[PDB]
């Protein structure tokens, strides 16, 4: 009694693909009989996404309802996954099991091997990444504040500064490492590694704080730096 | 001279969206002119998706590659953003902003206000949180293990414990928090909050455990416990 697993590979966002799992030693049409899919995230742990039972009742994870359909071919005697509308979010190993509803007892059995799904449509060249320091601080009103962030790459001077109100659009308030937005008050100076300086700290001041290079696509932010009052 | 938004809200995963980007002061055919939506998970930083210029030039960030689009209408002066193929990673506040490549200078500026879209097929209720403890634990060969797992509500004895090891796909150990799997060795047992105890540490019996509640669906499994060697 063994389940064999066929599919899975490289795929693009957005497209479909289609998972097999031969059923051997047993049949699909048997009573009690259910097949499931699980799968795991690489270096995480597992998810339950469906379950087909041998009386057409199913049952989905929410997130793949409306894109992953499970299904069993008796003549072959193979249970199907059909994934489309695939994201990113998708990238894991994917395994078949052997469900048996035949009062108390329900477990996943005689796993099949799995195989990697990975939903991706880039190079193996890695994306700019930026650091922000530090990722929280804490002031009062008229001190001085200075927020770092660093680039993987030498980016040159293609940095902006944003800030960010809770519940509000972000804001520039320097492109180009230095150069200040018009409107925004000249405590606010940029400077290069990467520094925005706030040299008096004002009540509106107290916000979310955002880095990003426009020298490559994709542009890339810094993860924040909210600075929080004392 | 700002932009107005428009669009979001609650869509089923695999759905379909549009967001408008109405441009109020400017003109987005003008030369220089360029258009971009960039997104915030809830609780998250700033992540760029796209950009389109006056010359129709355009960049995509990879996992939005084949399922969005971005575009502008000139009658109405919006841009806009098809959003296909949604997945509950695209669950974010998504803004739009103004791009002017007009030779250092290229900034997102006089943001849209922002508006939330939720990927999701779910009800209110929360899904049965599975906590195993501890997440990693250190033995040697011979030792006694107690690894302990606890359900988020009453799931009475409805609870299967797994082992998998390195690249190997998960193996029943216990069904229905007692009962061991036939042909697994009986220094394994389950008990009852729930625990899975090995009397005696084997060399084969270094690897991760997962416990899993089959009372309701989803089936829920806990976040691991790797034993690995002193």
């Known amino acids: 009694v063994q389940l064999v697993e066929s599919g899975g590979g490289l795929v693009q966002p957005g497209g479909s693909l289609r998972l097999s799992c031969a059923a051997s030693g047993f049949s699909l049409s048997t009573s009690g009989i259910g097949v499931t899919w699980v799968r795991q995230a690489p270096g995480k742990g597992l998810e339950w996404l469906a379950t087909?039972?041998?009386?057409?009742?199913?049952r989905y994870a929410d997130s793949v309802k409306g894109r992953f359909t499970i299904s069993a071919d008796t003549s072959k005697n193979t249970a199907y996954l059909q994934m489309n509308s695939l994201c990113a979010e998708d990238t894991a190993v994917y395994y078949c099991?052997?469900?048996?509803?035949?009062?108390?007892?329900?477990?996943?059995?005689?796993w099949g091997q799995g195989t990697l799904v990975t939903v991706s449509s880039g190079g193996g060249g890695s994306d700019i990444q930026m650091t922000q320091s530090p990722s929280s601080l804490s002031a009062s009103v008229g001190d001085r504040v200075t927020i770092t962030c660093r680039a993987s790459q030498d980016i040159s001077s293609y940095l902006n500064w944003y800030q960010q109100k809770p519940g509000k659009a972000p804001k520039l308030?320097?492109?180009?490492?230095?150069?200040?937005?018009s409107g925004v008050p000249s405590r606010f100076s940029g400077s290069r590694d990467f520094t925005l300086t706030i040299s008096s700290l004002q009540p509106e001041d107290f916000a979310t704080?955002?880095?990003?290079?426009?020298?490559?696509?994709?542009?890339?932010?810094?993860?924040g730096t909210k600075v929080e009052i004392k | 001279v700002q932009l107005v938004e428009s669009g979001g809200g609650l869509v089923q995963p695999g759905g379909s969206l549009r967001l408008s980007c109405a441009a109020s002061g400017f003109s987005l055919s003008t030369s220089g002119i360029g258009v971009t939506w960039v997104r915030q998970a809830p609780g998250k930083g700033l992540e760029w998706?796209?950009?389109?210029?006056?010359?129709?030039?355009?960049?995509?960030?990879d996992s939005v590659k084949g399922r969005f689009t971005i575009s502008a209408d000139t009658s109405k002066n919006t841009a806009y953003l098809q959003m296909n193929s949604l997945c509950a990673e695209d669950t974010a506040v998504?803004?739009?902003?103004?791009?002017?490549?007009?030779?250092?200078?290229?900034?997102?500026?006089?943001?849209?206000?922002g508006t939330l879209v939720t990927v999701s097929s779910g009800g209110g209720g929360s899904d049965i949180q599975m906590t195993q403890s501890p997440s990693s634990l250190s033995a040697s060969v011979g030792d006694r293990v107690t690894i302990t797992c606890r359900a988020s509500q009453d799931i009475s004895s409805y609870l299967n414990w797994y082992q998998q090891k390195p690249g190997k796909a998960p193996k029943l150990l216990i069904y229905?928090?007692?009962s061991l799997h036939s042909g697994v060795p009986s220094r394994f047992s389950g008990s009852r909050d729930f625990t899975l105890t090995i009397s005696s540490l084997q060399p084969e019996d270094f690897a991760t455990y997962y416990c899993?509640?089959?009372?309701?669906?989803?089936?829920?499994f806990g976040q691991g416990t790797k034993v690995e060697i002193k």
């Open positions: 229905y928090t007692s």
């Open positions: 899993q509640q089959y009372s309701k669906f989803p089936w829920t």
């Open positions: 099991a052997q469900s048996a509803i035949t009062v108390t007892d329900s477990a996943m059995d005689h």
């Open positions: 087909i039972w041998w009386d057409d009742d199913n």
